[PDB]
């Protein structure tokens, strides 16, 4: 089965699927050549407040559908066990931003500005570093466990679209090193 557009908006497509394309957005922290914290794969992703808010107003509308629709019932979710978060509120790269965190097991289908899909980790560690700016398919899912109450988001792909200044290395906590 393919993936079958519902909803086309700047930045943005929903899919039939509920699929989510979010477009050119800044990346942060990203873990696509290997899993990081059951380990995932993962990426954060900035998404500029002035640009992207016909994205989010989807993005929302999604997030309270995901939580309506949970098997065992309209699950309560607080703001903070979202996978989207406010940079101006919650979190200095965040500022005017909006802030996604996905995640998946699997490794996620990675493009490079050509879309060609990248197969070797050093390569797509090379690649997409944090700060480039890439597009990024998710999918939202509900949580319910002894973990808690989330709604998140399932990472698909991640494709790179421009380079720009690298966030670094140097942004680990490392404050639990002897604990
Ligand atoms: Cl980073
Ligand atoms: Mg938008």
């Known amino acids: 089965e393919k993936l079958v557009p519902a909803k086309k908006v700047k930045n943005g497509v929903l899919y039939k699927s509920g699929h989510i394309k979010v477009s050119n957005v800044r990346c942060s922290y990203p873990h696509l050549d290997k899993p990081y914290g059951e ?6 992703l ?62 996620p289908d990675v493009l490079n500005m050509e879309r060609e899909e ?16 890439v597009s990024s398919v998710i999918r939202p899912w509900s949580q319910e466990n002894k973990y808690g109450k989330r709604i998140n988001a399932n990472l698909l792909s ?11 290395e140097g942004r680990v906590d490392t404050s639990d090193a002897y604990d």
Request: hydrophobic share 35%.
């Open 39 to 44: 380990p995932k794969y993962s990426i954060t």
């Open 46 to 107: 900035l998404m500029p407040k002035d640009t992207h808010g016909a994205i989010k107003k989807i993005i929302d509308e999604q997030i309270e559908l995901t939580k309506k629709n949970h098997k065992t019932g309209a699950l309560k979710v607080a703001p903070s066990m979202l996978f989207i978060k406010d940079g101006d509120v919650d979190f200095p790269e965040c500022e005017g931003m909006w802030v996604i965190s996905a995640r998946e097991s699997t490794r």
């Open 118 to 133: 990248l197969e070797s980790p050093n390569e797509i560690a090379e690649e997409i570093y944090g700060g480039c700016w």
């Open 158 to 168: 991640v494709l790179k679209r421009k380079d720009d200044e690298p966030f670094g």
